[PDB]
Design an enzyme around this catalytic site. Structure first.
Site, PDB file in Angstrom:
ATOM      1  N   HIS A  13       0.831  -1.204   0.000  1.00 39.91           N
ATOM      2  CA  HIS A  13       0.000   0.000   0.000  1.00 39.91           C
ATOM      3  C   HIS A  13       0.867   1.257   0.000  1.00 39.91           C
ATOM      4  CE1 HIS A  13      -3.051  -2.979   1.328  1.00 39.91           C
ATOM      5  NE2 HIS A  13      -3.757  -2.275   0.460  1.00 39.91           N
ATOM      6  N   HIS A  66       1.247   1.340  -5.767  1.00 39.09           N
ATOM      7  CA  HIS A  66      -0.146   0.899  -5.778  1.00 39.09           C
ATOM      8  C   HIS A  66      -1.074   2.046  -6.163  1.00 39.09           C
ATOM      9  CE1 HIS A  66      -3.901  -0.983  -4.859  1.00 39.09           C
ATOM     10  NE2 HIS A  66      -4.125  -0.205  -3.815  1.00 39.09           N
ATOM     11  N   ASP A 111      -5.434   5.393  -0.790  1.00 42.88           N
ATOM     12  CA  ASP A 111      -4.716   4.678   0.267  1.00 42.88           C
ATOM     13  C   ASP A 111      -3.659   5.548   0.964  1.00 42.88           C
ATOM     14  OD1 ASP A 111      -5.939   2.091   0.474  1.00 42.88           O
ATOM     15  OD2 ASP A 111      -4.743   1.305  -1.207  1.00 42.88           O
ATOM     16  N   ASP A 130      -8.812  -1.215  -7.843  1.00 39.91           N
ATOM     17  CA  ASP A 130      -8.141  -1.626  -6.607  1.00 39.91           C
ATOM     18  C   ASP A 130      -7.870  -3.127  -6.598  1.00 39.91           C
ATOM     19  OD1 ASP A 130      -7.008  -0.752  -4.078  1.00 39.91           O
ATOM     20  OD2 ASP A 130      -8.978  -0.744  -3.128  1.00 39.91           O
ATOM     21  N   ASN A 133      -5.022  -6.477  -9.739  1.00 40.61           N
ATOM     22  CA  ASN A 133      -3.727  -7.154  -9.901  1.00 40.61           C
ATOM     23  C   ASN A 133      -3.833  -8.495 -10.612  1.00 40.61           C
ATOM     24  OD1 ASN A 133      -2.577  -6.224  -6.515  1.00 40.61           O
ATOM     25  ND2 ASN A 133      -2.736  -4.939  -8.359  1.00 40.61           N
ATOM     26  N   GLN A 165      -3.842 -17.134  -3.664  1.00 37.30           N
ATOM     27  CA  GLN A 165      -4.176 -16.405  -4.901  1.00 37.30           C
ATOM     28  C   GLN A 165      -5.339 -17.050  -5.633  1.00 37.30           C
ATOM     29  OE1 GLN A 165      -3.440 -13.393  -5.988  1.00 37.30           O
ATOM     30  NE2 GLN A 165      -2.374 -13.406  -3.984  1.00 37.30           N
ATOM     31  N   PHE A 194      -8.406 -16.301  -3.705  1.00 36.54           N
ATOM     32  CA  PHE A 194      -8.687 -14.877  -3.890  1.00 36.54           C
ATOM     33  C   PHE A 194      -9.413 -14.629  -5.210  1.00 36.54           C
ATOM     34  CE2 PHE A 194      -6.702 -10.547  -4.965  1.00 36.54           C
ATOM     35  CZ  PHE A 194      -7.655  -9.828  -4.247  1.00 36.54           C
TER      36      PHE A 194
END
Ligand code: AKU
Ligand code: AKU
Ligand code: MG
Ligand code: MG
Ligand code: ZN
Ligand code: ZN
EC number: 3.1.4.53
Lengths: 323, 318
Positions: free
Chosen positions: B70, B74, B111, B225, B228, B276, B279
């Site tokens: 963060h 980012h 952020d 956000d 990725n 991952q 996620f």
């Protein structure tokens, strides 16, 4: 004198406690002595192992962080809301309904609910680009602040009145207190009342005839509305108390309007001392806000609140008669 | 040099780490400036370029250089991803210039001053931030407050020439968008995006009321956000390394303090690759699948890459 104050505090269970007389007789400590009296009456020091010296130290520091120079949103208002919440919690329709921790949360929330109030509205703080509004992103600006101050003061020397609660008790109380104080934001009033109305229309009672509240959402909603009713209870009080509250809110409003006029801003409703009708504003306040709310609360706890509603309706007719 | 890389600011998969290196750790500043000119925002809102640069530098300075994820890189990545999502064809006319400005500014600040630990960590440690913000969107309230407060430093008020109403409208939209990046709001946000997809009206998307338009902007920056795993793999794998370092450092602090270790934060038990895949399956793909449906078929290449990257991470599990 202590004897005369002790005599007045025998009325702590009664609607219409002479809270201004208690403020005078306690040496401008109405919040401390009324909170202490209530904690003793409900045995909260023994239940939660609260040392008495810690309670008094916290209460005096909390009371200190109300502004003595704001006409309405001061330690007398806080003491009044605490005491009114205490009476509403005792209503027969709610007997044995709330736990000792929920009772503690509602009374604590009432005590802190306006602390460090500067005597101007959220919208004034937003429109003047205040540091508070910048901190809180224009969202429940005052109420977030009251909470943060109220909890932060627990960290001062000998002020942690919750030091003997378990960690789970502290976590639960903190969540409930936040939920309650954020609900005192006046911009939430219509949504809170809509939900209270739904709960009245779908009300369930137990074998003992008390309110059936079997989930957190319903329980916290009753506590939110209870403290909101207490916050908006001035027109339900005996007239000699109500008129003093009216005098004080108008002084606070007019001083805000003087700052708005001086800054070239539109004057907020009821804040223009040159174009205000105090009596018509009270009748409208009762008709559009206070009576819709109290009539609904009275339905939830029927017939417990009938005398409070009767007094509200008499006071409305009195202000109307002065027009 | 740094100029050549910035040529693809309009492409998904910008080489943001190379840009971070080639700009002397100023990716947020150079990417923001490049985007403001591609969209003609400095002319539209009469923003003095020197004021834009002074604010951006100051904002970038308030991202922490010792936080592995963060940080300012980012912030630059979310800014650039929002910038590409705003150019989706199915959204070719939806949002006005002020709404575009709000989505991009929100991305840049969303952020700022992040300490590298979660909201739940801040709440459970009785942090000053959680005390200030009553345990409610603690970080995101702080990111906003810092982002707007920096506008008041010398020659930092990039909105000096907006009308009073424009400033008030921009402020509201930025707050609504950054608050929606709180991860605890994800399911509610996704449910609203799903409902919008079911009630979708199109000619190109037709959104008539502010409530629908702000919801698309909230979900858009949320998608940026959480973008990725939709990026080219060499980028995605770097983001994974960075978030896992941040998670493991938080879990080292939770273990020591005696708290339950947050999910994925225990370096002695975490499976980076399983995390991952989970996620993607539970968060990123349901979100990007619904977004793809909203802008069908303009997100199909993004969705394809996500599914490829999921296949690759899965293949790294024995
Ligand atoms: C005794 O009399 C009063 C007491 C109080 C108020 C107004 C009174 O009298 C008009 C206002 C109500 C604010 C408010 C918000 N929307 C409204 C719409 C209509 C009227 C008022 C309001 N308060 C301000 O903190 C609480 C105490
Ligand atoms: C590249 O990989 C990642 C990137 C990011 C995260 C997780 C990643 O990979 C596991 C988390 C997702 C939110 C989240 C927090 N706890 C969770 C538990 C379950 C599901 C989601 C979450 N972020 C935290 O700031 C945002 C970026
Ligand atoms: Mg208040
Ligand atoms: Mg964030
Ligand atoms: Zn109040
Ligand atoms: Zn982010």
């Amino acid at each position: 004198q202590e004897d005369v104050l002790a005599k007045e505090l025998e009325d702590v269970n009664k609607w219409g406690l002479h809270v201004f007389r208690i403020a005078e007789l306690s040496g401008n400590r109405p919040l401390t002595v009324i909170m202490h009296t209530i904690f003793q009456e409900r045995d909260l020091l023994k239940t939660f192992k609260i040392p008495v010296d810690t309670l008094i130290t916290y209460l005096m520091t909390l009371e200190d962080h109300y502004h003595a120079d704001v006409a309405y949103h001061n330690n007398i208002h806080a003491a009044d809301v605490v005491q009114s919440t205490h009476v509403l919690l005792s209503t027969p329709a709610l007997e044995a309904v709330f736990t000792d921790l929920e009772i503690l949360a509602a009374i604590f929330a009432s005590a802190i609910h306006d602390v460090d109030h500067p005597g101007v509205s959220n919208q004034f703080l937003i429109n003047t680009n205040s540091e508070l509004a910048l901190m809180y992103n224009d969202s429940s600006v005052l109420e977030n602040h009251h909470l943060a101050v109220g909890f932060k003061l627990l960290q001062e020397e000998n002020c942690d009145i919750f030091q003997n609660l378990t960690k789970k008790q502290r976590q639960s109380l903190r969540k409930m207190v936040i939920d309650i104080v954020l609900a005192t934001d006046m911009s939430k009033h219509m949504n809170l009342l809509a939900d209270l109305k739904t709960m009245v229309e779908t009300k369930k009672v137990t074998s003992s005839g008390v309110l059936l509240l079997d989930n957190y959402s319903d329980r916290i909603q009753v506590l939110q509305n209870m403290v909101h009713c207490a916050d908006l209870s001035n027109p339900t009080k005996p007239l000699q108390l109500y008129r003093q509250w009216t005098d004080r809110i108008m002084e606070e409003f007019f001083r805000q309007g003087d700052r708005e006029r001086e800054r070239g801003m539109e004057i907020s409703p009821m804040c223009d001392k040159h174009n205000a009708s105090v009596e018509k504003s009270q009748v409208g306040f009762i008709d559009y806000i206070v009576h819709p709310l109290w009539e609904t609360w009275a339905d939830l706890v029927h017939p417990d609140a009938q005398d409070i509603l009767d007094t509200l309706e008499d006071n409305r007719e009195w202000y109307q008669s002065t027009i």
